[PDB]
Design a protein around this ligand. Structure first.
Ligand SMILES: O[C@@H]1[C@@H](O)[C@H](O[C@@H]2CO[C@@H](O[C@@H]3CO[C@@H](O[C@@H]4CO[C@@H](O)[C@H](O)[C@H]4O)[C@H](O)[C@H]3O)[C@H](O)[C@H]2O)OC[C@H]1O
Ligand SMILES: O[C@@H]1[C@@H](O)[C@H](O[C@@H]2CO[C@@H](O[C@@H]3CO[C@@H](O[C@@H]4CO[C@@H](O)[C@H](O)[C@H]4O)[C@H](O)[C@H]3O)[C@H](O)[C@H]2O)OC[C@H]1O
Ligand SMILES: O=C[C@H](O)[C@@H](O)[C@@H](CO)O[C@@H]1OC[C@@H](O)[C@H](O)[C@H]1O
Ligand SMILES: O=C[C@H](O)[C@@H](O)[C@@H](CO)O[C@@H]1OC[C@@H](O)[C@H](O)[C@H]1O
Ligand SMILES: *[C@@H]1O[C@H](CO)[C@@H](O)[C@H](O)[C@H]1NC(C)=O
Ligand SMILES: *[C@@H]1O[C@H](CO)[C@@H](O)[C@H](O)[C@H]1NC(C)=O
Ligand SMILES: [Co+2]
Lengths: 434, 434
């Protein structure tokens, strides 16, 4: 797609700290951009929609190539349309925003310039942020994560994409998502099937795969840390059910691991660690700091800070594994005890290290789940299982929770706030901000 | 040996903090005891010495058994004889103390009661302490380390030792030291050879081996972190040159690894990290905090704090290894690049994990080196090598430094102060003291 300018595009600024082994941190100035899927897509020459509700214009978009030629992405009114605001080092995303139309959530990328994404090399480094999850009930996910996207959003590879990172193009993740409207500078109208339960979305014939580091998928009830390897590290198109992932009839046929090696303290047995109020180690009614360390071995370490008190990731015992580090032994024990082979089939932490050794783009999002109602994060899943099935229970939310239309109606003012991002060598991010 | 009471034995008190995963720390009250080798050893029935200068009474001690029957260890005047003092959570050790006689340094163990050593299970935990090394020049070593000693100092196994932990019996380490005067409830007079350069010491026919975790061997110039595995984890007697270690003609014949997998940031190439004054990352003219984390994988992580600024162990590149974690890959790369097979021959970090999974006793000492002048810690070693030999240079001290008689004459008021010991689960020791 190209870019149009019937609505101006001004990325909300966001600062963050880059820290050094020598003990100082210095402020960096970036901004955030909303993903292309949230945007108005219209004809280059008029205000006629190329995509409307959950279907495409059959005349503007008779095939993927003609559609991309005929159509552009336009600018975003971040606060009034999307409920996205920033102030200094803080970003807030509202759940439901009512303007001329209803908008649900947002997916945002950190920019290095008006036209390029910021790339972070995670290996050997740590990433710290503060989060307020107090306004996130069952069924919602405020997510902070990394994906192996191109810095230009795909422009250099696919010259029919001239919109680029400035318009939030080029997304990929470990689900090989097929709900994207443009992939590789072409539309995704071929094979499009409108969602049966979502007025605004559908599933197309192609998907967009890449490595995904889920630092944070969470609400006030549950939180998870999950690496997802793929056999191709960076962004790559896939076709139909060969994509695998959430959007395909077959979840596992493809190049990415859509399950990951997840660490959810509640799932692992510590049901007292994270939740609302003072009965929990970390009280989710209050802001908390989350620090994630990517050691050169490929293992991942985690600690939290709240009210100046530090907590390592809680210890877990699973099969022969005992510890608090997300390493080969954990991931192997997890597959053995909870089931599955997707993570190992895709090369596990060894393959994942290829992603963290390269650049990844920072994503911050707020979403509800039209496929599984977020039950995999905060409930019992699948819902017929009980607590006697190892790993079935992931949080205390009812298996009836998270119906999108219900949570959108009952909790439209839900929100997440991410702030005080700091990044640098392991051991450096707790030093004074600059 | 038995215990006598011509001089009273009052262990200087020392407090330390035990911290919990839940974020609180509580004060523990212990004390310190001086190692038996520093004590007066005399006949049970009189004040006649069993050991004097560097030789034994040939009448009281004609063989190891008769000697142990005839002889006792007596009490220690900690400050006036040994220059050992405590105050709250702080312990100081002076280098040379002049009383009726000259004393050099001390080796001390943390006690749980008047009659038992405190045992620490390191695996899954971290150990934090503060240290002032400002008064330690080239050739000296203020050491804080752990060894796999019995809690009773050997009494239960060797009933002819009735003195016990109260009199600092039962030492062992990864050198299988043969300078000990009593081992396994018998003297070490059989095969005794007085040191050619030390008026107070010698080498006997038996030695005392066990696993050794050198958290801290250091002065104002250099510091090293070193695990030493043994094929028998706990205390075990050895015979003659079969002992191996520093005290034997053959260094490597035995059950322990006397070299270890050492991590010295200077040796690894960062000559700016640790030293006196503001040209160094850590300024050794000032107190610093040293934190050492024993992850369940068997790897060891390290960070430092000075003036509220945190520094991870600096990154090192050695062969194919890159990182700041002391792990299997580091130790293997170290042997490949610097030479040697002792660490791996004895089972490496896997074998070492058997020590940290069990109890170990905390040792704090101050010493000069009558065998190699501490050159292995702070100089170029061996001394014919140059900086073109990988790993030869370990600090900036001259290869002429550390002659014991010289440093004892020039720097008798050298001292080390260890303080604010805190111990608990990984991630817990930076929380408020109780
Ligand atoms: O001037 C008017 C334009 O502003 C208006 O633009 C519309 C803005 O909203 C667009 O709908 C978005 C589409 O994305 C939805 O989010 C989905 C959530 O799940 C994700 O998996 C999925 O990928 C996302 O697509 C979002 O909730 C919703 O608001 C709409 O399509 C635009 O047309 O158009 C009319 C102009 O007059
Ligand atoms: O009442 C008098 C007693 O106090 C006096 O006791 C003497 C106290 O000093 C003893 O000499 C010690 C022996 O250990 C030396 O340290 C060595 C350092 O290197 C280590 O490897 C080695 O293992 C240690 O042994 C220490 O510097 C030195 O002071 C002496 O043997 C006692 O006799 O005895 C006379 C009474 O009248
Ligand atoms: O691991 C989770 C999964 O691979 C990703 O698809 C997930 C990460 O949070 O991404 C969200 O997918 C749904 C979409 O609505 C939202 O914008 C994404 O952040
Ligand atoms: O790793 C070093 C070696 O294995 C140990 O012998 C060393 C640890 O610092 O121990 C010292 O050995 C010499 C003695 O004079 C001193 O008391 C010990 O702490
Ligand atoms: C030494 O280590 C410190 C702390 O990691 C680092 O800041 C410094 O750049 C390093 N210097 C060299 C020369 O490697
Ligand atoms: C949960 O984790 C916290 C922090 O490590 C710990 O203090 C607490 O004892 C754990 N509780 C349970 C039930 O495992
Ligand atoms: Co590790």
């Amino acid at each position: 797609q190209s870019a149009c300018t019937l609505q101006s595009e001004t990325h909300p600024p966001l600062t963050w700290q880059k820290c050094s082994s020598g003990g100082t941190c210095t402020q960096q100035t970036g901004s955030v951009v909303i993903d292309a899927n949230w945007r108005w897509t219209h004809a280059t020459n008029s205000s006629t929609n190329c995509y409307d509700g959950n279907t495409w214009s059959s005349t503007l978009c008779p095939d993927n190539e003609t559609c991309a030629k005929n159509c552009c992405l336009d600018g975003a009114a971040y606060a009034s349309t999307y409920g996205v605001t920033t102030s200094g080092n803080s970003l807030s995303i509202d759940f439901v925003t009512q303007s001329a139309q209803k908008n649900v959530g947002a997916r945002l990328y950190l920019m290095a310039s008006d036209t390029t994404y910021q790339e972070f090399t995670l290996l050997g480094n740590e990433f710290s942020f503060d989060v307020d999850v107090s306004q996130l009930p069952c069924g919602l996910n405020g997510a902070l994560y990394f994906v192996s996207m191109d810095a230009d959003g795909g422009v250099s590879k696919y010259p029919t994409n001239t919109a680029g990172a400035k318009y939030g193009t080029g997304y990929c993740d470990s689900q090989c998502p097929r709900d994207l409207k443009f992939i590789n500078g072409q539309a995704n109208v071929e094979g499009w099937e409108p969602s049966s339960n979502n007025a605004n979305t559908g599933i197309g014939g192609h998907g967009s795969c890449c490595s995904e580091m889920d630092i944070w998928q969470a609400n006030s009830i549950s939180e998870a840390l999950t690496p997802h390897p793929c056999t191709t590290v960076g962004q790559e198109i896939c076709e139909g059910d060969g994509c695998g992932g959430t959007y395909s009839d077959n979840r596992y046929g493809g190049t990415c691991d859509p399950d990951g090696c997840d660490w959810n303290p509640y799932r692992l047995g510590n049901t007292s660690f994270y939740g609302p109020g003072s009965s929990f180690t970390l009280d989710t009614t209050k802001k908390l700091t989350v620090v994630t360390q990517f050691e050169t071995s490929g293992a991942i370490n985690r600690y939290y800070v709240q009210n100046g008190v530090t907590f390592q990731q809680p210890n877990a015992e699973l099969g022969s594994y005992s510890g608090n580090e997300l390493n080969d032994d954990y991931c192997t024990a997890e597959e053995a005890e909870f089931g599955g082979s997707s993570f190992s089939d895709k090369g596990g932490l060894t393959q994942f290290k290829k992603a963290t050794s390269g650049g990844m783009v920072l994503v911050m999002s707020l979403w509800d789940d039209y496929y599984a109602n977020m039950l995999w994060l905060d409930s019992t899943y699948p819902t017929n299982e009980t607590s006697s099935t190892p790993g079935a229970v992931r949080g205390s939310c009812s298996t009836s929770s998270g119906v999108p239309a219900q949570v959108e109606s009952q909790s439209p003012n839900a929100k997440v706030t991410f702030s005080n991002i700091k990044f640098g060598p392991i051991g450096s991010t707790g030093n004074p901000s600059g």
